[PDB]
Amino acid sequence: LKKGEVSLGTSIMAVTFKDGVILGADSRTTTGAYIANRVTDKLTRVHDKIWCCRSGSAADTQAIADIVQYHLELYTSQYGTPSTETAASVFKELCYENKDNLTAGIIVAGYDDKNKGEVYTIPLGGSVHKLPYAIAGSGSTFIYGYCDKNFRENMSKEETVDFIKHSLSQAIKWDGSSGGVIRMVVLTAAGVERLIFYPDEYEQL
Amino acid sequence: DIILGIRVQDSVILASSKAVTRGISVLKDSDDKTRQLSPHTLMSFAGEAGDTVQFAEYIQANIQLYSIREDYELSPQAVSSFVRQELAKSIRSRRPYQVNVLIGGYDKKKNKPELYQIDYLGTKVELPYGAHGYSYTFFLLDHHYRPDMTTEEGLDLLKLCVQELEKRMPMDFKGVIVKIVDKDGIRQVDD
């Protein structure tokens, strides 16, 4: 990490449920002890139903996301809608081939008519892992055990929303770089849905 | 590595000490710290071993090429400007090396002697007298310099400076090679 950059210290979550996937994050961007931006949309979109959340260096992650969106546009022009695995592979290649110059970590959530929603994680270094759910960020370390004790396969939409809300609320509570509102994107067969939850709602949980 | 140059009314006198190497005993009669750029332009150099001689030979080759190509002799001012440009270009993309150059000539078109000094960064300055090496002698030159001095007076002043330098030096200071550039060309004084 080059000196004087901006670090994406956040709370990133992605949970796969019966009807698709949900990607959630906070909205805090800090530079040391000062909150540079308390309203930040960290749910980066790379395709109509393929979204991602970034961590590490903001500039490197933004460049990688732009290149991945370009690649997916070319693929869609040629072959049509890509699967989440292809986007994860492009992300992994971009992160791994430049790991000596760029520090980047991605969490990719996607949906398609065949696989029915998937979550992939590319941590620092460039490895890729496919998981039923993923958490990342500086504030994730405080919810690990919680996330291991309340996740069930094939949950309904409401159960997944509540699980993500509770976990992100705890991460916000215990982490200094996590705060603000909770933003969630639901990817299902119907379409893309946006959800925002304010502090006065999740702080009472 | 001590070089001196004194400009008098009709000529330029350049004096250079014998070059020595650390831990090596050498006995020779030659001037390896001076190159004749042209029949009326002489150059003396002092600095790091290797780089300085390569630069001096490069400059001499370029000036000889110009003289052959144009069938004409460059003025001392043009020679000094070319040397300054090449020296600035040499350290363009590398760590600078220690080098100090005294260029003495006799402009035939102006019919007058000239002397220039260029340091390691490429700063060309026209001087009435100059020295490099030990850092003592500028006071002696200042108190005993006149713009209208003859060759003999300049040689006497150079002898006084050489004696003063030898006295402070721990008797390891060998002889000084002295050359005179004037209207008749470049000659060496064996006195």
Add this chain to the structure above:
Amino acid sequence: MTDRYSFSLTTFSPSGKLGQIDYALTAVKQGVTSLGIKATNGVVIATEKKSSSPLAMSETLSKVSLLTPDIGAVYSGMGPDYRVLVDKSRKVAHTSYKRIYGEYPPTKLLVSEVAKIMQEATQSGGVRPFGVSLLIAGHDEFNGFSLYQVDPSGSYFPWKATAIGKGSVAAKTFLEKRWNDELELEDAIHIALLTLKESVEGEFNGDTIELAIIGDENPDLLGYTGIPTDKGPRFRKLTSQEINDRLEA
């Protein structure tokens, strides 16, 4: 290796004439007529908008292009060459002058750059010379208003009033008798309209001819207010409504 080179396409004929340049001039002489007139208050550049198909939108293609806020140009010959040269000239106006001296280039220097680019294509090994002729009208502080003509060979000359294209000879003859040192911008516009009226075989209205002027500044076209020293653009393309109004009057 025979792949390291390519023989020159333009070569001297036994009579001493470069054949490709002459053929490019011949191609230019078959194009639609364009003209330029220099007045004491501005320079008028005019041309005829040809249309192979009546269903084509005439406003989508413009034969008059803004090079700089003070310099404009018109072409006669091949359209694609005009488009490529206009793009290159717009890029050069910024790379060579504005990013160096902090100001837009004069008319003569931009014309010289365009002429050099055009000449470089006549001494090459795989590109034919550009088959266009150029009329460039501009204004600069230290030289007033200027009009130049650039040949496919890369030669440019200043003109008081000139015309290129199919009816270049007739237009030049008409403009020889209708030019003087006391001419005004409005008189120049009227003379240009009259000269174009004798060259258009088909419908002659505001949607078949195109005009532009280099005159006084237009501060309303800057798009921002607050800086007195920021002069507005002097190049202005006359609308079809204004052309119709002038034709009626």
Add this chain to the structure above:
Amino acid sequence: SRRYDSRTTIFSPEGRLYQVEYALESISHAGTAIGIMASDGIVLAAERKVTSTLLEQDTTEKLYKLNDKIAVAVAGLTADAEILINTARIHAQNYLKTYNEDIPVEILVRRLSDIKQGYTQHGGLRPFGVSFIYAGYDDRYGYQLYTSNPSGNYTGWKAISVGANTSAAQTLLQMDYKDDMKVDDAIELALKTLSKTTDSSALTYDRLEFATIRKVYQKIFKPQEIKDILVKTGIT
């Protein structure tokens, strides 16, 4: 023959370069330029062959300036001439920056001639097809007048002419030139030669370019000055 003229890098069986000869032949299609070296200055004159009405005669097609001491007269294609003139200006500025002195005329002439010769020795390059008359002053030789052709050869002259009527102009100069003429005599001789060798009815001011180099500064005559000189010389 037509089997040995399509390329610039092929010799004819007799040992002739046909493209270079065609480039030399192309010179006679341009206006006439005359250079005369006087005992205290240099005079350059040029006849505008392709000048008619409706042309801004105030604003130079044959006379160009390289530095404060060297000027050129052009006969041939104007675009190639501009290319070579910009190259010569850059070379003169480089010489001034390097040696802190003004470049001698012969060095610049030789550089341009070498460029011209190099352009005749590559398959993908055609000869420039321009001729230059160089008028310059330097502290080595004084005033000097040179000419260079598309082949890459250059020569020094006391009075030279290029263009469309070179033979007649050279004959007139040979008849009338004197080694002790002044600048005014050279101006009068150049004007008389241009008037005699012109293809127009009269030698009007609108079809002439004039320049002088004299003590050292240049002077490019404006149309009013040209008209005044024509009136003085009696040509009117």
Add this chain to the structure above:
Amino acid sequence: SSINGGIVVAMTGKDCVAIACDLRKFEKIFHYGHVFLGITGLATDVTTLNEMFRYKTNLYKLKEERAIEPETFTQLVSSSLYERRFGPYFVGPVVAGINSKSGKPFIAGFDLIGCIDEAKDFIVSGTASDQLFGMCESLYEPNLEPEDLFETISQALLNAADRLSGWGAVVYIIKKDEVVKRYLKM
């Protein structure tokens, strides 16, 4: 031998400018027509900049067929300085001149990478915090005659020199028509 360092003072008069430099030959002020430039710093970089600007101004005069204005020269100097972004010269330049078409005096200053610092009263280069900027500010009065401006700049140079030894100064007074060069061998 030494030479490095120095001071440059630029002041604006009624219809004239004054540019002054110190001196022990080697003068820090050079003119490219009716525009003057004074550079403080390494002598090698000063000479390099002088040669480059003479080159560029000669080419500009040959092409444009006219002299270069102070504003255009200021922009040119800024761009040339920014070209060496990662290898910048150890210099501070100051430009003075009179616009030959409008007559308004122009003075500007630059950092080592060509950031233009245009001041309407006066500009000090080399040393601007010890005894020069304050004394120039105290002694400055707007809209002075050329003689008054010359006296003010000479007084400022003397005050800076005092705060004795071998000292000289070169002062240029620039009007729209003629330029006066004076020495201060005091």
Add this chain to the structure above:
Amino acid sequence: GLSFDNYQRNNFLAENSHTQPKATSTTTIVGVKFNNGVVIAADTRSTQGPIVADKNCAKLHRISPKIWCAGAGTAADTEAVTQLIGSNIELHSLYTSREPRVVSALQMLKQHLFKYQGHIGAYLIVAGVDPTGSHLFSIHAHGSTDVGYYLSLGSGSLAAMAVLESHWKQDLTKEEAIKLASDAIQAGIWNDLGSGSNVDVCVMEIGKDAEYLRNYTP
């Protein structure tokens, strides 16, 4: 492009006897977005270290007649980058024959700043209007961009941000937005030593020419 010559010579001079001359390091910059446009304001006092150099500095840069920006950090880098992006934007608008967009300038600036890996010290606030609406972005020197409604930058950015958090709401008029920006700049001036003097303002509204105001406070 930019030359790397004399890098070793400069390092040697710094390490042996010489000190490299410093570069101007530019000072409050603010941007406030109101219902039908944006306002970008900056302080006008520039100080050379601890000494005030000028009481009226134009720190507002122009990219397009309706796209403006204000920069902090190295002044030369900010000016050069803004001018280069403005030339590119003008060429692109001529090529497409359309009004330039703020997103295009943002993309160009981001890619250019990421090319040099943060060696160009320009931190920008870019505001503007285009056929798609009014936009306001913040650009970091390493090539990262952020979107917001009100932004502050510079040495006195904390006081300006406090003022903005105090008196900002979604529905604001042009006069209220100008007053809020002026108040933020004034707080940065009074409570910090890096800002002073007057304020430069630029207002860009949808469907109207950009209005540039110098010395709004007097």
Add this chain to the structure above:
Amino acid sequence: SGYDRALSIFSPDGHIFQVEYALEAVKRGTCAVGVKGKNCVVLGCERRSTLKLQDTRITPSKVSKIDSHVVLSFSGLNADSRILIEKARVEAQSHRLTLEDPVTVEYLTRYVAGVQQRYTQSGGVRPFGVSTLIAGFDPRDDEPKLYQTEPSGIYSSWSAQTIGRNSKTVREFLEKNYDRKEPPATVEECVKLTVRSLLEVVQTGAKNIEITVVKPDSDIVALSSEEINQYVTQIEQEKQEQQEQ
């Protein structure tokens, strides 16, 4: 026939015709003769009659000093000779820089021949239409050296060689008047022989002859018009006296 359109095409009988055509281009140039003596080398060159208006202060000379001990004359296209001479001078200076020793005559001849050969190894280039004579002495040596180089890149060592236009007559004259067993002892005899050889083709005489004399320890002297005129007058007087009786 059809085999003369490129340098890379052999003819059925085994000739490259473009080389012959370059030699034909050479044959049009002015005559150039080189004579090797007992202790000197003399290079004579024929000049065209100068025109009335042509300047006579700055015209390039036929004989050029490549180095303080080596001179070079040419015949053929005058423009390519400048390129060859410049390359030779640069190579001489480079060799002196790299090896601290001035070039030998054979080394410079070989370099010029190599450049000429290298300019015949591509179809997009034109060979130099110049044939050169290189004369001098090896450093710290008293053996005269004279070499001839051809456009194809072939060089040879001669004792007396004429190249250019009407060179066959001068070559026959030298073959009938020069014997290698008895080279001229003095410089004056060599100069007289060179003048008499040149006068076979030169229409006017002293005003179309240029002579350069090279002697060891780098002694290169270009004769003036008066000396050549004296030689020509003496030769004409001797010829008239011999023809009288």
Add this chain to the structure above:
Amino acid sequence: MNIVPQDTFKSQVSTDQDKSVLSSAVPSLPDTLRQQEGGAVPLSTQLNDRHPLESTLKNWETTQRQRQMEQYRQIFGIAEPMKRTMEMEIVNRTDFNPLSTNGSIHRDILLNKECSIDWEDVYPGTMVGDDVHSKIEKQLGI
């Protein structure tokens, strides 16, 4: 698929690595006179003390071009990068202008930089060489 250029350092060195400038007396050694670099610049000094960003800036558009070609190969096939490289090579090889260094218009059109300016475009930047013949020899390989 690289964003920042990689492998910019030399792996081997020799005295005859610069094939264009080699001595004729000793072909295994470089020609110092014709290099025209200053006369005191050994090659080893080029291996140490370089600005870290110089390599990144010097080879930046090439890396993006290579990444674009790799993406085309992955998505479109071999034919698309083959055709792009063939067109670019034809355009580069046909051009030969010894008196200029500015690129052609068609090269910019192929590179999609018709209306793009960088510091390379703004800043495009002797006794021996730098003439037409040297460039002819370099181009033709003789």
Add this chain to the structure above:
Amino acid sequence: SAAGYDRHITIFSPEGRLYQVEYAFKATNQTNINSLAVRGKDCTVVISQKKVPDKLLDPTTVSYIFCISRTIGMVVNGPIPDARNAALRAKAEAAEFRYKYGYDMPCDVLAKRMANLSQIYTQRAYMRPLGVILTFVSVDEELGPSIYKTDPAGYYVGYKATATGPKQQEITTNLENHFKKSKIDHINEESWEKVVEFAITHMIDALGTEFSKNDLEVGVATKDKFFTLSAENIEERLVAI
């Protein structure tokens, strides 16, 4: 026919013409099929004629309409290999524009880009023009429905409506007469289906002898997406007059 050269490369004939460009233009009519493009109120419709002389050929694989991007559709008149080459290059150009400038590529900009490439092909001696005619149709967010045509000569221009093919004169004259009668530079219908029906009727009354669902190919561009109709959609449009 060219006399000497110009049979191989693109240089000027003595009359000042480029014969290779003209021959490439002539090569565009080999397919003997016609295409027609019209603009609706907020949509654009392209209709092309399908010919399947060989009964062994699979009809579903025969197509000359391509989806360059989400908003831009393209119709190619000419041989199919150059058609596919141009389609791939257009896709790459549109994606590169979107990546570089941060917004979707307009139709006119893509047409100008392809025209610049065609100019490169017409000027370079070692490159040949593609013997195809391209028609880009879309709904630009700043200009509404848009049709732009580019030819092998490097010339591009926008049309209120257009028709290209071996029988383009009849369709062009019929469209001109209709526009003169209705005095509107477009079609005053709010649904793209009615515009498709109008274009089918115009093609029927221009070419003659009608056609079935297997002899037609229809593409519709809206402000959201460009799509290509199938056999059932074309047949249903045929039913409604």
